Design an enzyme around this catalytic site. Structure first.
Site, mmCIF file in Angstrom:
data_model
loop_
_atom_site.group_PDB
_atom_site.id
_atom_site.type_symbol
_atom_site.label_atom_id
_atom_site.label_comp_id
_atom_site.label_asym_id
_atom_site.label_seq_id
_atom_site.Cartn_x
_atom_site.Cartn_y
_atom_site.Cartn_z
ATOM 1 N N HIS A 186 -56.498 47.502 0.292
ATOM 2 C CA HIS A 186 -56.690 46.172 0.854
ATOM 3 C C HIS A 186 -55.372 45.543 1.295
ATOM 4 O O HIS A 186 -55.390 44.528 1.997
ATOM 5 C CB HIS A 186 -57.383 45.289 -0.170
ATOM 6 C CG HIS A 186 -58.055 44.079 0.411
ATOM 7 N ND1 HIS A 186 -57.744 43.569 1.653
ATOM 8 C CD2 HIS A 186 -59.022 43.280 -0.092
ATOM 9 C CE1 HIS A 186 -58.491 42.507 1.889
ATOM 10 N NE2 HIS A 186 -59.276 42.312 0.848
ATOM 11 N N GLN A 508 -53.851 32.379 3.359
ATOM 12 C CA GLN A 508 -52.851 32.764 2.371
ATOM 13 C C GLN A 508 -51.533 33.075 3.071
ATOM 14 O O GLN A 508 -51.515 33.712 4.127
ATOM 15 C CB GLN A 508 -53.301 34.001 1.586
ATOM 16 C CG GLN A 508 -54.677 33.888 0.935
ATOM 17 C CD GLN A 508 -55.799 34.367 1.841
ATOM 18 O OE1 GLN A 508 -55.797 34.108 3.047
ATOM 19 N NE2 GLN A 508 -56.760 35.078 1.262
ATOM 20 N N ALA A 565 -57.650 22.799 -1.110
ATOM 21 C CA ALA A 565 -58.665 21.778 -1.304
ATOM 22 C C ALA A 565 -60.014 22.398 -1.659
ATOM 23 O O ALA A 565 -60.251 23.588 -1.417
ATOM 24 C CB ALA A 565 -58.814 20.926 -0.036
ATOM 25 N N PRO A 566 -60.922 21.617 -2.249
ATOM 26 C CA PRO A 566 -62.296 22.104 -2.433
ATOM 27 C C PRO A 566 -62.861 22.566 -1.097
ATOM 28 O O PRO A 566 -62.451 22.100 -0.026
ATOM 29 C CB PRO A 566 -63.064 20.880 -2.953
ATOM 30 C CG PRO A 566 -62.040 19.867 -3.318
ATOM 31 C CD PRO A 566 -60.729 20.228 -2.700
ATOM 32 N N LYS A 567 -63.834 23.474 -1.178
ATOM 33 C CA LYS A 567 -64.398 24.109 0.010
ATOM 34 C C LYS A 567 -64.782 23.094 1.087
ATOM 35 O O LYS A 567 -64.412 23.251 2.253
ATOM 36 C CB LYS A 567 -65.605 24.952 -0.394
ATOM 37 C CG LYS A 567 -66.291 25.665 0.772
ATOM 38 C CD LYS A 567 -65.510 26.891 1.213
ATOM 39 C CE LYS A 567 -66.329 27.716 2.217
ATOM 40 N NZ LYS A 567 -65.791 29.101 2.370
ATOM 41 N N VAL A 571 -62.991 22.550 4.976
ATOM 42 C CA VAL A 571 -63.629 22.693 6.278
ATOM 43 C C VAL A 571 -63.562 21.376 7.039
ATOM 44 O O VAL A 571 -63.268 21.352 8.237
ATOM 45 C CB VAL A 571 -65.081 23.178 6.105
ATOM 46 C CG1 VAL A 571 -65.770 23.307 7.455
ATOM 47 C CG2 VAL A 571 -65.121 24.515 5.348
ATOM 48 N N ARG A 572 -63.802 20.257 6.344
ATOM 49 C CA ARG A 572 -63.853 18.954 6.996
ATOM 50 C C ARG A 572 -62.490 18.546 7.547
ATOM 51 O O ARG A 572 -62.403 17.985 8.648
ATOM 52 C CB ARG A 572 -64.377 17.906 6.009
ATOM 53 C CG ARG A 572 -64.337 16.463 6.549
ATOM 54 C CD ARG A 572 -65.094 15.511 5.601
ATOM 55 N NE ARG A 572 -64.914 15.853 4.189
ATOM 56 C CZ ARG A 572 -63.847 15.520 3.456
ATOM 57 N NH1 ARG A 572 -62.843 14.834 3.995
ATOM 58 N NH2 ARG A 572 -63.786 15.873 2.177
ATOM 59 N N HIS A 589 -60.446 35.248 8.404
ATOM 60 C CA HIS A 589 -61.815 35.704 8.592
ATOM 61 C C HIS A 589 -62.778 34.571 8.240
ATOM 62 O O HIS A 589 -63.324 33.939 9.148
ATOM 63 C CB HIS A 589 -62.073 36.972 7.791
ATOM 64 C CG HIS A 589 -61.166 38.099 8.171
ATOM 65 N ND1 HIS A 589 -60.937 39.180 7.349
ATOM 66 C CD2 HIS A 589 -60.416 38.304 9.280
ATOM 67 C CE1 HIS A 589 -60.089 40.005 7.939
ATOM 68 N NE2 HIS A 589 -59.756 39.496 9.112
ATOM 69 N N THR A 591 -61.753 31.698 7.142
ATOM 70 C CA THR A 591 -61.089 30.490 7.631
ATOM 71 C C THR A 591 -61.162 30.353 9.155
ATOM 72 O O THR A 591 -61.020 29.235 9.665
ATOM 73 C CB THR A 591 -59.624 30.462 7.203
ATOM 74 O OG1 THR A 591 -58.975 31.620 7.724
ATOM 75 C CG2 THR A 591 -59.464 30.424 5.651
HETATM 76 C C1 LIG Z 1 -60.170 35.553 -0.294
HETATM 77 O O1 LIG Z 1 -60.721 34.330 -0.772
HETATM 78 C C2 LIG Z 1 -61.186 34.210 -2.065
HETATM 79 C C3 LIG Z 1 -61.405 35.328 -2.886
HETATM 80 C C4 LIG Z 1 -61.878 35.183 -4.190
HETATM 81 C C5 LIG Z 1 -62.150 33.915 -4.689
HETATM 82 C C6 LIG Z 1 -61.944 32.799 -3.870
HETATM 83 C C7 LIG Z 1 -61.463 32.901 -2.563
HETATM 84 C C8 LIG Z 1 -61.264 31.682 -1.676
HETATM 85 N N1 LIG Z 1 -62.571 31.093 -1.297
HETATM 86 S S1 LIG Z 1 -62.825 30.477 0.223
HETATM 87 O O2 LIG Z 1 -62.331 31.366 1.206
HETATM 88 O O3 LIG Z 1 -64.202 30.144 0.352
HETATM 89 C C9 LIG Z 1 -61.826 28.948 0.316
HETATM 90 C C10 LIG Z 1 -62.093 27.823 -0.513
HETATM 91 C C11 LIG Z 1 -61.322 26.678 -0.482
HETATM 92 C C12 LIG Z 1 -60.166 26.535 0.373
HETATM 93 N N2 LIG Z 1 -59.356 25.398 0.428
HETATM 94 C C13 LIG Z 1 -58.230 25.236 1.245
HETATM 95 O O4 LIG Z 1 -57.619 24.185 1.191
HETATM 96 C C14 LIG Z 1 -57.899 26.379 2.102
HETATM 97 C C15 LIG Z 1 -58.661 27.490 2.067
HETATM 98 C C16 LIG Z 1 -59.840 27.652 1.211
HETATM 99 C C17 LIG Z 1 -60.691 28.806 1.120
HETATM 100 C C18 LIG Z 1 -60.356 30.563 -2.337
HETATM 101 O O5 LIG Z 1 -60.935 29.630 -2.854
HETATM 102 N N3 LIG Z 1 -58.940 30.630 -2.330
HETATM 103 C C19 LIG Z 1 -58.126 29.545 -2.946
HETATM 104 C C20 LIG Z 1 -57.862 29.797 -4.475
HETATM 105 O O6 LIG Z 1 -58.138 30.919 -4.916
HETATM 106 O O7 LIG Z 1 -57.404 28.820 -5.085
HETATM 107 C C21 LIG Z 1 -58.225 31.759 -1.678
HETATM 108 C C22 LIG Z 1 -57.903 31.520 -0.178
HETATM 109 C C23 LIG Z 1 -58.418 32.110 0.962
HETATM 110 C C24 LIG Z 1 -57.861 31.621 2.204
HETATM 111 C C25 LIG Z 1 -56.924 30.656 2.003
HETATM 112 S S2 LIG Z 1 -56.732 30.376 0.345
#
Ligand SMILES: COc1ccccc1[C@@H](NS(=O)(=O)c1ccc2[nH]c(=O)ccc2c1)C(=O)N(CC(=O)O)Cc1cccs1
Lengths: 697, 14
Positions: A186, A508, A565-567, A571-572, A589, A591
């Site tokens: 990965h 990331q 931030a929370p999900k 998005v908002r 992807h 995002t």
């Molecule tokens: C690869 O993504 C996995 C894999 C496993 C668990 C969680 C995630 C993610 N869930 S999600 O993609 O829906 C999601 C949510 C909030 C979010 N809030 C923001 O402000 C920006 C992005 C974001 C993305 C996840 O929450 N994080 C953040 C964490 O781990 O603290 C990892 C990230 C992926 C892209 C950027 S940061």
């Protein structure tokens, strides 16, 4: 003779190195017959049992080794590795720290300790421990490559060119010497490895699963050859560790319930326990059958269950990600097995027949990157549940604090009803956008934001501060529920300028490389006043990005970071950007879907790997071919035109705002119908007696 | 994120 047991032990070590695990076990055990109190043989045996997935039996032999030899540091470190794999992180740490206490010069223990810090979010300490390991043992591929990923994570690009050279050299040597590469599949997408090397990495990691199923001595399964036993219905099984609060559910949680029950019978196999979220509730309720394989840890018994359900097509949604049990696919309980959605790349493994993709993501001329046959969805293979999860973002209004569409934004399920009460709203043609003038209501909303209040009530309507969603409704913040109130989102909340262009990327930081930041710097230098809006993931990477940017001629105040931030807020708040700059090395992807759902145009340059071509596939389905660059110059020119020709920006943002609804990109009902057509091509092909072949239609 | 791999040590008998 003592030579006897020593010879058996040392020969077994050789056989282990060569990949002949069964013979190694045989030799270790003969050594223990000859010399029962042989601590080294107990520990070495436990190490190969661990590799075979026999973790409790391995622990028993580690403890025996240490009973015999209480200061046996090798056994403590190896045992730590087994406890780490059992998810006993504290136990692992206690073992590693004891091994290092016994032998401070024990390079392997320092490296294994570092892997705990890495996984815990303590990247500075992981880096320190990997560097101690490499000081003690300068030829150490696991430590070097995992250090390299630590440095990728925090965007430390010191001697990055020499780092990539050595990474490639390490992989080349391990592949040539028939060893497991120290780069994870990965992560291979992030480094300048050949496609052959990336597929070979994947194949070698898949081979680890074979060592774990071979010990089960299970015969091949007999597979159905018709649909008679299922009343003409095709039985599809989705296998995932991520039925719960995880991005994969945020993408496809609607798809099981949208399958046509007249032609399909849907089985969802969860590899994770129930985390109590609405995501898990929904799939459990909407699938025809839901099976909790987290209660069935033996892969032989779990595969038996899948086979007993009569699955025709089994779908691997994990690939090489956390929670995977690819052993289930290696046992082949189903006649057709496909990769889908969760893993952006090839399994490289013989036991997967297809990867579900599309002609944009995986054009036929690059089929050699994949071990699977290509199975094309007609538009993009990517999908998102945004229309079901975030319908409150389908409409927006703004406050005219002076007219901008992304400085002060309101969204709400009942937003139209609220605006009916305000007789002085203006409707602007660009759907249509209502504009609230700077009246009493607007001043109260602005005052809430500036004072940091949680919410106010106007005319009976609740108006919420977008920064406070978790205090208002935690389930709305996660995307488990649609927000009920009118939410207010502003550039002031994130320290963004009100008089300049905002370029955003919320990926990331490990997806950024020097080449990408140089290209972003070129853009900002051509658009006066513009800023770049990035994510603290992690925060310790912020000063590295700032230093490299300032080194490229960008003052620090041109780059603005925000916390994760929370999900729903993530998005908002995409609505506040003017333009999203996608990462060429590995695209956004999930995002990418998120920013498009907010109406924010995304600029992308598709590469060669699957992971580098997803954003352009999404934009092609959306219908915005003008956002897809053929090279770096085009990428910069597109971004600069969007940031300097404000009429063009208005036109393109209007395209995204409209086509996120009218295109197939977020249409889960159409997606499921197209997915079903593809399954039937696979099935008819198989039922006619054929081996998997490309389904490129 | 997936679990970071670790390195098992093979003990030579002497
Ligand atoms: C690869 O993504 C996995 C894999 C496993 C668990 C969680 C995630 C993610 N869930 S999600 O993609 O829906 C999601 C949510 C909030 C979010 N809030 C923001 O402000 C920006 C992005 C974001 C993305 C996840 O929450 N994080 C953040 C964490 O781990 O603290 C990892 C990230 C992926 C892209 C950027 S940061």
């Amino acid at each position: 003779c003592p030579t006897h047991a020593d010879s058996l032990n040392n020969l077994a070590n050789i056989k282990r190195e060569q990949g002949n695990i069964e013979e190694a076990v045989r030799l270790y055990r003969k050594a223990l017959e000859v010399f029962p109190e042989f601590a080294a043989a107990h520990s070495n045996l436990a190490s190969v049992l661990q590799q075979q997935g026999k973790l409790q039996e391995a622990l028993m032999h580690y403890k025996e080794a240490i009973r015999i030899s209480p200061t046996f540091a090798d056994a403590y470190s190896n045992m730590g590795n087994t406890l780490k794999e059992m998810q006993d992180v504290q136990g692992a740490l206690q073992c590693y720290t004891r091994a290092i206490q016994i032998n401070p010069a024990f390079a392997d223990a320092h490296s294994n300790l570092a892997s705990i810090h890495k996984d815990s979010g303590n990247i500075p300490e992981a880096i320190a421990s990997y560097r101690t390991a490499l000081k003690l043992k300068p030829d150490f591929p696991d430590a070097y490559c995992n250090l390299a990923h630590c440095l990728q994570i925090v965007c430390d690009w010191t001697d990055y060119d020499e780092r990539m050279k050595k990474l490639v050299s390490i992989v080349a040597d391990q592949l040539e010497k028939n060893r497991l590469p120290s780069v994870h599949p990965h992560h291979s997408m992030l480094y300048p490895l050949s496609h052959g090397f990336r597929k070979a990495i994947a194949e070698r990691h898949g081979n680890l699963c074979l060592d774990k199923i071979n010990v089960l001595h299970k015969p091949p399964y007999e597979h159905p050859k018709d649909l008679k036993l299922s009343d003409g219905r095709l039985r599809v099984g989705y296998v995932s560790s991520d039925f719960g609060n995880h991005p994969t559910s945020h993408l496809m949680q609607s798809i099981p319930g949208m399958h046509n029950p007249d032609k399909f019978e849907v089985f969802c196999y969860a590899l994770s326990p129930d985390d109590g979220t609405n995501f898990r509730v929904k799939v459990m309720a909407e699938a025809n059958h839901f099976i909790d394989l987290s209660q069935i840890p033996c892969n032989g018994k779990a595969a038996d269950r899948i086979h007993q359900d009569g699955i025709h097509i089994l779908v691997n949604m994990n690939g090489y990600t956390k929670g995977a049990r690819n052993e289930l696919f290696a046992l082949r309980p189903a006649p057709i097995q496909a990769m889908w959605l969760g893993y952006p790349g090839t399994s490289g493994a013989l036991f997967m027949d297809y990867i579900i993709t599309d002609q944009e993501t995986s054009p036929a001329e690059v089929a050699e990157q994949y071990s699977e046959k290509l199975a094309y969805m007609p538009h993009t293979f990517f999908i998102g549940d945004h229309a079901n999860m975030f319908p409150h973002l389908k409409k927006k209004a703004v406050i005219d604090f002076k007219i901008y569409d992304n400085r002060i934004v309101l969204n709400g399920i009942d937003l139209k009803a609220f605006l009916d009460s305000l007789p002085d709203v203006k409707i602007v043609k660009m759907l249509n956008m209502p504009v609230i003038p700077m009246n009493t209501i607007a001043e109260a909303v602005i005052e809430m934001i500036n004072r940091g209040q949680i919410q106010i009530t106007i005319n009976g309507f609740s108006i919420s501060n977008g920064l406070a969603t978790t205090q208002i409704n935690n389930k709305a913040a996660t995307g488990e529920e649609v927000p009920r109130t009118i939410i207010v989102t502003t550039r002031s909340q994130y320290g963004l300028p009100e008089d300049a262009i905002v370029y955003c990327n919320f990926n990331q930081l490990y997806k950024i490389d020097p080449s990408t930041l140089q290209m972003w710097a070129n853009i900002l230098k051509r658009v006066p006043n513009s800023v770049l809006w990035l994510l603290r993931f992690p925060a310790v990477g912020e000063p590295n990005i700032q230093q490299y940017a300032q080194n490229m001629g960008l003052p620090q105040n041109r780059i603005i970071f925000s916390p994760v931030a929370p999900k729903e807020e993530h998005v908002r708040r995409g609505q506040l950007a003017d333009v999203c700059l996608d990462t060429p090395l590995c695209n956004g992807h999930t995002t990418g879907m998120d920013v498009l759902w907010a109406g924010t145009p995304m600029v992308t340059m598709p590469g060669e790997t699957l992971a580098s071509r997803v954003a352009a596939s999404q934009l092609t389905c959306l219908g915005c071919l003008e956002l897809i660059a053929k090279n770096r110059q085009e990428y910069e020119d597109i971004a600069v035109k969007l940031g300097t020709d404000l009429e063009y920006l208005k036109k393109v943002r209007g395209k995204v705002w409209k086509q996120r609804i009218s295109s197939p990109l977020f249409n889960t009902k159409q997606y499921t119908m197209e997915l079903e057509r593809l399954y039937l091509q696979m099935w008819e092909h198989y039922a006619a007696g054929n081996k998997p072949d490309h389904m490129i239609k | 994120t997936h679990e970071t791999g670790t390195t098992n040590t093979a003990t030579t008998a002497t």
